[PDB]
Every structure is written in structure tokens, then in C-alpha cells.
């Protein structure tokens, strides 16, 4: 499913991401925009053989099981395909573990290079929340 900006903002809010670990909602929407263009079915393979999945492009090296990433962890305890659903619950649940890992939102490279330090509130402008 391809989310609209405000529709995703509302879903993330509903799932308790607004201000999660001190990160305002605009940060999460900005990260989803640049990581997957708001497409829950996005996948990208990395050089190390791991793959990034879903709206928040969560990596198979540590967070989900895809059965093809030799000696990887599954810290979220889910099959990576769960991250591609139209229902963002699994993606959100996993994102909360990642952001609590010590590096905050820096774990998402697109957040760090394209969102961090920008007016992220622009991502939720005009939405009914």
C-alpha cells in the first residue's frame, strides 16, 4: 500500500510514534518518505547480502528473519515479510525497538542525511490529527 502523507501521519500517531523517544511525528513521516516513498512493499538489497523491508526499510541483518541473511539476528521476532503489510503495526513495533537501541533515529541513514535538522514539522502541516 502507498500511503498519503497525512494518512500515514495519522496511522503513526495512532500507533504511539508521536514523540516516541523524543522524536516528533514529523521525524517519522520524513523518515518514511525518504526510506520508502511511503510504500509498504519497498525492498532493497544491501552489499552485505541483507535486505531492507517496508515503509521504514528495516534490515534483515538484525531485526527480522528473511531466511537468507546468514548469521543474522531477528531482534523483532518476526518474518521480514510481516514488514510489507498494508497494516503498519509490525513496522511500528519494530521501529520502537530500533530507536531505543542507543543511536536514536540515526539508525535510519535517510533520516540522518535528509531529515535531521530540517523543519520536520512541514511533514505534518495541514493534516487533521
Curated annotation (Swiss-Prot):
Task: Read off the InterPro entries from this record.
Answer: Glyco_hydro_22 (IPR001916), Glyco_hydro_22_CS (IPR019799), Glyco_hydro_22_lys (IPR000974), Lysozyme-like_dom_sf (IPR023346)
Q: Which reaction does it catalyse?
A: Hydrolysis of (1->4)-beta-linkages between N-acetylmuramic acid and N-acetyl-D-glucosamine residues in a peptidoglycan and between N-acetyl-D-glucosamine residues in chitodextrins
Q: In which tissues is it expressed?
A: In the egg white and polymorphonuclear leukocytes.
Provide the C-type lysozyme domain boundaries: 1-129
Q: Which cysteines are joined by disulfide bonds?
A: 6-127, 30-115, 64-80, 76-94
Enumerate the subcellular locations listed in this protein's record, separating them with semicolons. Answer: Secreted
**Stored Gene3D superfamilies:** 1.10.530.10
Q: Where does substrate bind?
A: 101
Q: Which GO terms describe its molecular function?
A: beta-N-acetylglucosaminidase activity; identical protein binding; lysozyme activity
Q: Where is the active site?
A: 35, 52
GO CC term, one of those recorded: extracellular space
- Keywords of the record: Allergen, Antimicrobial, Bacteriolytic enzyme, Disulfide bond, Glycosidase, Hydrolase, Secreted, Signal
One of the GO BP terms on file: cell wall macromolecule catabolic process
What EC identifiers does the entry list?
3.2.1.17
Please classify the protein's predominant subcellular localization into one broad category: secreted
> Where do the coiled-coil regions begin and end?
none
The annotated subunit structure for this chain is:
Monomer.
Additional observations: Lysozyme C is capable of both hydrolysis and transglycosylation; it also shows a slight esterase activity. It acts rapidly on both peptide-substituted and unsubstituted peptidoglycan, and slowly on chitin oligosaccharides.
Give the family, as the similarity comment puts it: Belongs to the glycosyl hydrolase 22 family.
Functional summary from the UniProt entry: Lysozymes have primarily a bacteriolytic function; those in tissues and body fluids are associated with the monocyte-macrophage system and enhance the activity of immunoagents. Has bacteriolytic activity against M.luteus.
- The protein here is known as Lysozyme C
Organism (species): Gallus gallus (Chicken)
* Gene for this chain: LYZ
Amino acid at each position: 500500500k502507498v500511503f498519503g502523507r497525512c494518512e500515514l501521519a495519522a496511522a503513526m500517531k495512532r500507533h504511539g510514534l508521536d514523540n516516541y523517544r523524543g522524536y516528533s511525528l514529523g521525524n517519522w513521516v520524513c523518515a518514511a518518505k525518504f526510506e520508502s516513498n511511503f510504500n509498504t512493499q519497498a525492498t532493497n538489497r544491501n552489499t552485505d547480502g541483507s535486505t531492507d523491508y517496508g515503509i521504514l526499510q528495516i534490515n534483515s541483518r538484525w531485526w527480522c528473519n528473511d531466511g537468507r541473511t546468514p548469521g543474522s539476528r531477528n531482534l523483532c521476532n518476526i518474518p521480514c515479510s510481516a514488514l510489507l503489510s498494508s497494516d503498519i503495526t509490525a513496522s511500528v513495533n519494530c521501529a520502537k525497538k530500533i530507536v531505543s537501541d542507543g543511536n536514536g533515529m540515526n539508525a535510519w541513514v535517510a533520516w540522518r542525511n535528509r531529515c535531521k535538522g530540517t523543519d520536520v514539522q512541514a511533514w505534518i502541516r495541514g493534516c487533521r490529527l
